[PDB]
Design an enzyme around this catalytic site. Structure first.
Site, PDB file in Angstrom:
ATOM      1  N   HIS A 177      -3.125  80.914 -10.402  1.00  0.00           N
ATOM      2  CA  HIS A 177      -2.903  79.853 -11.358  1.00  0.00           C
ATOM      3  C   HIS A 177      -2.692  80.282 -12.771  1.00  0.00           C
ATOM      4  O   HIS A 177      -2.282  79.463 -13.571  1.00  0.00           O
ATOM      5  CB  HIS A 177      -3.845  78.698 -11.298  1.00  0.00           C
ATOM      6  CG  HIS A 177      -5.144  78.915 -11.966  1.00  0.00           C
ATOM      7  ND1 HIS A 177      -6.221  79.372 -11.262  1.00  0.00           N
ATOM      8  CD2 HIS A 177      -5.520  78.607 -13.233  1.00  0.00           C
ATOM      9  CE1 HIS A 177      -7.284  79.381 -12.088  1.00  0.00           C
ATOM     10  NE2 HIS A 177      -6.862  78.914 -13.291  1.00  0.00           N
ATOM     11  N   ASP A 182      -6.056  81.339  -4.251  1.00  0.00           N
ATOM     12  CA  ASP A 182      -5.818  81.551  -5.687  1.00  0.00           C
ATOM     13  C   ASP A 182      -5.971  82.996  -6.139  1.00  0.00           C
ATOM     14  O   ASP A 182      -7.052  83.443  -6.503  1.00  0.00           O
ATOM     15  CB  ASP A 182      -6.797  80.682  -6.456  1.00  0.00           C
ATOM     16  CG  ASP A 182      -6.308  80.413  -7.861  1.00  0.00           C
ATOM     17  OD1 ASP A 182      -6.975  79.664  -8.566  1.00  0.00           O
ATOM     18  OD2 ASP A 182      -5.257  80.907  -8.310  1.00  0.00           O
ATOM     19  N   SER A 186     -10.595  82.207 -15.981  1.00  0.00           N
ATOM     20  CA  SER A 186      -9.838  82.222 -14.734  1.00  0.00           C
ATOM     21  C   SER A 186      -9.207  83.560 -14.491  1.00  0.00           C
ATOM     22  O   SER A 186      -8.633  84.121 -15.431  1.00  0.00           O
ATOM     23  CB  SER A 186      -8.702  81.205 -14.877  1.00  0.00           C
ATOM     24  OG  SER A 186      -9.188  79.885 -14.606  1.00  0.00           O
TER      25      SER A 186
END
Lengths: 224, 224
Positions: free
Chosen positions: A45, A89, A182
């Site tokens: 992402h 992810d 992230s």
């Protein structure tokens, strides 16, 4: 990173700070981790138009003599990354050059595909992300010690997928990874067992981490 | 700035780069301009939880000799700024300190309350904002020459309010101030006549700048 501490400068030399330009020309940040002289792992992402990787940093606002700033050649996204379940992810970044392995810029071990991390371990997550639900991202690297949960902590009490995903963080403390974290690592006895993936808008534990163990065979196949 | 060029470094000593923490802990930018040793002019839409002003910059990602980084004490938004007509889009920043006036950091004149700018004047707009609709903000100051329009160009061809607002830019060019250029000066004949307020999401001319002339009697009552 919510609830944690400033890192010791240069003590996590695998740490990659990502400067991303998104498709609509937004500058965004993400974390990542150096697993070879050419490959950075991060979260799918953290896709963009262009990514610059900064290695060897503590304070990315400062022009530290350890730093190595490399452009990304390739973004290799997991071929089953759905973008709704949030599943798979994980992304590899190929760098334009090899890094110079130095004390401040070096690799992190990955598990063996047989290594699974149990509930009850206490691991470390690091990043330059938001230090609060309404507080801005950090210019210096921060770290937080988090506990690996049972599947029950995220399933019937929320969401998940256990083979692929780790459930991390005890709702008994506001300790979390958040926005800008992230694609950062989760280290368990110094091994990269997790990648910061997602959670609750309010940063309330537990959160979801991709489970590095599972994807080691994908990781080796692409890198080799 | 879309369709402009780099400025000559330090050649616009009034220019302020604003680094803004929004109420949700986001870092945004705007522009602004130094009007006295303690006050910077900018757009009311550039309001934030916390404002840091950087003077004397060209490349804001280098620590240039000429720079003065100062925090804002007060944010004084015009008493009739609404948030739909986007009217009265003007704000005073009271600085924590007074600035030191140097070769690289000094003030721009304000018009007299009787000084209207005509349609058909050629003016300059500067900023660190986006260099295209999908392109990222700029690290070094850019500038563009813009043409002051007749009311007609923004009324029957769209939006407006002439007393308080200027229409700027001919549909003959894609030259425009964009995202991040908000709160920057429109320089006409030496003098700051405009502040970058808003436009069309495609950044297609004409756009709307706050008419500085009109707000001078407010500016002097607040500062003095």
């Amino acid at each position: 990173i919510i609830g944690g501490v400033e890192s010791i400068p240069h003590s996590r030399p695998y740490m990659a700070h990502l400067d991303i330009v998104t498709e609509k020309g937004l500058r965004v940040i993400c974390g990542g981790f150096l697993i070879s002289r050419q490959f950075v792992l991060t979260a799918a992402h953290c896709k963009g138009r262009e990514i610059t990787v900064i290695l060897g940093a503590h304070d990315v606002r400062k022009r530290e003599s350890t730093q190595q700033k490399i452009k990304v050649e390739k973004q290799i996204i997991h071929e089953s990354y759905n973008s709704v379940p949030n599943l798979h992810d994980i992304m590899l970044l190929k760098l334009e050059k090899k890094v110079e392995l130095t004390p401040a810029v070096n690799v992190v071990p990955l598990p063996s595909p047989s290594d699974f991390i149990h509930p009850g371990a206490m691991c470390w997550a690091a990043g330059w992300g938001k230090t609060g639900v309404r507080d801005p991202t950090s210019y210096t690297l921060r770290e937080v010690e988090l506990r690996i949960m049972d599947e029950k902590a995220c399933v019937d009490y929320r969401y998940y997928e256990y083979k692929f995903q780790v459930c991390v963080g005890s709702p008994t403390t506001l300790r979390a990874a958040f926005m800008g974290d992230s694609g950062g690592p989760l280290l368990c006895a110094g091994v990269a067992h997790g990648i910061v993936s997602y959670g609750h808008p309010d940063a309330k534990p537990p959160a979801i981490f991709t489970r590095v163990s599972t994807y080691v065979p994908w990781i080796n196949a692409v890198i080799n």
